[PDB]
């Protein structure tokens, strides 16, 4: 128990709780695209979501770059769609 704390998860979590909820109440907003600020922040947010009552997921273009996204219950993504979403828009070409 000392005085002095920075760059932690706790604070981050709280912020997520407020954001998530705000998005839930907001009808106009059907989804939200979060930015990969930290490496763990991803898992943290995911938890806060599943608890809030929304759909959470992670999608990134490059293995190194991985962002987190969230969708609503009704506007939630589908199984097949989810797989394709991660793989990309339409790899049909190759």
From Swiss-Prot:
Q: Which residues carry this modification: Phosphoserine?
A: 78
Q: Where is the R3H domain?
A: 10-73
Q: Which domain of life is it from?
A: Eukaryota
Its subcellular locations are: Nucleus
- Please describe the organ and tissue distribution of this protein's expression: Detected in fetal brain.
* Protein name in the entry: Sperm-associated antigen 7
Which region of the full protein is contained in this chain?
44 to 124 of 227
